[PDB]
Design a protein around this ligand. Structure first.
Ligand SMILES: CC(C)[C@H](NC(=O)[C@H](Cc1ccccc1)NS(=O)(=O)c1cc(Cl)cc(Cl)c1)C(=O)NO
Ligand SMILES: [Zn+2]
Length: 385
């Protein structure tokens, strides 16, 4: 999924390893392009939210076990290189699963829609769904991306999937899509129970955020106002509490949104940019929104292809269905007050590996998830404050 092994020292080439500028909407950061439309910034997130980078503890913080605040984490290149080697490992772990592979494939193909012109006859990029890659002469070159994995802000364990919005457009909830930024650290993990029993496999924590970007990438995210959205996303049993006629009500709201995309494309006459033709980008979305193309060359939304895509995105792609595939132990519900944050290093193949995570085959750890047990495997889990 990441073809070439990256080191943080590896020289910039302005193609994959580059100094880049986030929409603000400031200074350039080293960032790696581990796959089409996926970039990884080994820095703390002091960029996405105007001056939310004091990066130093609040007046009174939640402490154990919800908030962690080290002002120094992800400052050393040695940590940044371990980070990228961290995140690259969880992606391949995720890719090794038939379901993570389909998911990233769903993430990579989910190009944020080109709905950036006030006109309705013209395709135009929404610069918020783009980064600025610095070229040799200091100048910047807009690149389109779907996903950025950047490290956390002040609270190190406050992992989330956020996105830049619009003056009028809800980009995650109108079928269009929006570049997704995932705050994440594979150098820490949350302990749960069912004495302090076990510990979350960071691939599960990562897979959770990729579910979320997926929903937002395809514009079928549920308004934040437990959230319905997190409920769809963790899956399992607690995904029955959802009024099915609030699920019907949405599975129809994002069909009529997908039909309004198909309209916008059919009515498109011009397009903006040097990059790509009106026809290249119409096939691009005709590939995203699995549209259908009659002889005239007018897109329609197939109610059947849309229903499998919506099913795959919303109820096939779930934390719960991920722990099936990962043969791991995970909180069976979203209400298991993780009563610790642990220090970890999943990079070494003796610590943790793509195929079995912490629960190493041919070891004591492969049974009753003894790899995940904070007691048995005390080396790999050091409780913090
Ligand atoms: C880190 C990540 C897993 C994240 N979860 C949180 O923010 C939870 C919120 C929450 C609320 C209710 C139940 C479960 C989770 N924060 S937390 O994971 O730090 C947490 C939750 C609880 Cl209930 C207690 C504690 Cl001490 C910490 C998330 O899902 N991003 O998409
Ligand atoms: Zn969630």
């Amino acid at each position: 999924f990441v073809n070439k092994q990256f080191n943080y020292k590896d020289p910039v080439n302005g193609v994959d390893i580059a100094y880049i500028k986030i929409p603000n909407v400031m200074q350039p950061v080293k960032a790696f392009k581990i796959h089409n439309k996926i970039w990884v910034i080994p820095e703390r997130d002091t960029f996405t939210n105007p001056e939310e980078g004091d990066l130093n503890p609040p007046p009174e913080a939640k402490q154990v076990p919800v908030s962690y605040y080290d002002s120094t984490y992800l400052s050393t290149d040695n940590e940044k290189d371990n980070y990228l080697k961290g995140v690259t490992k969880l992606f391949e772990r995720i890719y090794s699963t038939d379901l993570g592979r389909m998911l990233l494939t769903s993430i990579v193909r989910g190009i944020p829609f080109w709905g950036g012109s006030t006109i309705d006859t013209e395709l135009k990029v929404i610069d918020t769904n783009c980064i600025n890659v610095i070229q040799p002469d200091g100048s910047y070159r807009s690149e389109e991306l779907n996903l950025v994995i950047i490290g956390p802000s002040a609270d190190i364990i406050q992992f989330e999937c956020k996105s830049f919005g619009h003056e009028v457009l809800n980009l995650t909830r109108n079928g269009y899509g929006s570049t997704q930024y995932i705050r994440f650290s594979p150098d820490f993990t949350f302990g749960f129970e069912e004495a302090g029993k076990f510990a979350t496999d960071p691939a599960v924590t990562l897979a959770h955020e990729l579910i979320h970007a997926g929903h937002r990438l395809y514009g079928i995210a549920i308004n934040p106002n437990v959230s319905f959205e997190e409920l769809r996303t963790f899956g399992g049993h607690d995904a029955k509490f959802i009024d099915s006629l609030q699920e019907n009500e949405f599975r129809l709201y994002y069909y009529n949104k997908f039909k309004d995309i198909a309209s916008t494309l059919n009515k498109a006459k011009s397009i903006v940019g040097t990059t790509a033709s009106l026809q290249y980008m119409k096939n691009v979305f005709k590939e995203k929104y699995l549209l259908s193309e009659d002889t005239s060359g007018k897109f329609s939304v197939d109610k059947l292809k849309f229903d499998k895509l919506y099913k795959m995105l919303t109820e096939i792609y779930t934390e719960d269905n991920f722990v099936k595939f990962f043969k791991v132990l995970n909180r069976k519900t979203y209400l298991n007050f993780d009563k610790a944050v642990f220090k970890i290093n999943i990079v070494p193949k003796v610590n943790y590996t793509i195929y079995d995570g912490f629960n190493l085959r041919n070891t004591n750890l492969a049974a009753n998830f003894n790899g995940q047990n904070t007691e048995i495997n005390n080396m790999n889990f050091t409780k913090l404050k």
